[PDB]
């Protein structure tokens, strides 16, 4: 009964904490429901082009976390951003484009950016 | 025999972000894990902590290293690995006094130098 369609397009300047080349994926959570992209192996500028659909069960910010896949182990945090969906309700098309600067554990910009398009079907 | 490793300090240990390292140092020998206290907000943490392993006749597999790992303590998420180094105790302890000082260069997740180093003292009492 209603839908949130989030297309995660790409990221730029995604750098890990060492000599490893970013194995980046995004974990996005809307209304407590989490969706995660595939891992782009060995890229500092990952292109996912992955579309997602949050079934709005008849009912605001989108929280996206970018992590580095760790070759058999616990993935490491690279950066995160919160995007307000109010601006999505703003334009008549019920959709908007976002260029999100990734923030660190201390909420400071890491220098990486995530580009995603949101859309609402009431 | 008693294996006593004194962890003095680390130098140039940095987190991946604006966080100033809240470093602690784990040390593992023969499946026995030891861990220092956490030094808040220092890229050159000093622990000055001593640990002991009673060998007590546990398999002395020919080559058996001390595995040291330095991590950054986190309050909102998982602790972050900063650097790890493998100390060859047989080679370092090969002195008349059965004691030595070792500067272990810390390695990253891909086995490449991080530029950080851990200073320690090792000794074994027959
Ligand atoms: Ca990689
Ligand atoms: Ca990785
Ligand atoms: Ca800190
Ligand atoms: Ca920390």
From Swiss-Prot, chain B:
Binding site for Ca(2+) 1: 19-20, 22, 41
Tissue expression summary: Expressed in skeletal muscle, myoblast, myotube and in the syncytiotrophoblast (STB) of the placenta (at protein level). Ubiquitous. Highly expressed in skeletal muscle. Also found in heart, brain, spleen, intestine, placenta and at lower levels in liver, lung, kidney and pancreas.
Domain C2 stretches: 2-102
Outcome of mutating residue 80 to D: Moderately increased calcium affinity
Subcellular location: Cell membrane, Sarcolemma; Cytoplasmic vesicle membrane; Cell membrane
Medical condition linked: Muscular dystrophy, limb-girdle, autosomal recessive 2: An autosomal recessive degenerative myopathy characterized by weakness and atrophy starting in the proximal pelvifemoral muscles, with onset in the late teens or later, massive elevation of serum creatine kinase levels and slow progression. Scapular muscle involvement is minor and not present at onset. Upper limb girdle involvement follows some years after the onset in lower limbs. Miyoshi muscular dystrophy 1: A late-onset muscular dystrophy involving the distal lower limb musculature. It is characterized by weakness that initially affects the gastrocnemius muscle during early adulthood.
Family that this chain belongs to: Belongs to the ferlin family.
Subunit structure of this chain's protein: Interacts with CACNA1S. Interacts with ANXA1; the interaction is Ca(2+)- and injury state-dependent. Interacts with ANXA2; the interaction is Ca(2+)- and injury state-dependent. Interacts with CACNA1S and PARVB. Interacts with TRIM72/MG53; interaction is required for transport to sites of cell injury during repair patch formation. Interacts with RIPOR2; this interaction occurs during early myogenic differentiation. Interacts with CAV3 and PARVB. Interacts with AHNAK; the interaction is direct and Ca(2+)-independent. Interacts with AHNAK2; the interaction is direct and Ca(2+)-independent.
Domain notes from UniProt: All seven C2 domains associate with lipid membranes in a calcium-dependent manner. Domains C2 1 and 3 have the highest affinity for calcium, the C2 domain 1 seems to be largely unstructured in the absence of bound ligands. The C2 domain 1 from isoform 14 does not bind calcium in the absence of bound phospholipid.
Function according to Swiss-Prot or TrEMBL: Key calcium ion sensor involved in the Ca(2+)-triggered synaptic vesicle-plasma membrane fusion. Plays a role in the sarcolemma repair mechanism of both skeletal muscle and cardiomyocytes that permits rapid resealing of membranes disrupted by mechanical stress.
Name the UniProt record assigns to this protein: Dysferlin
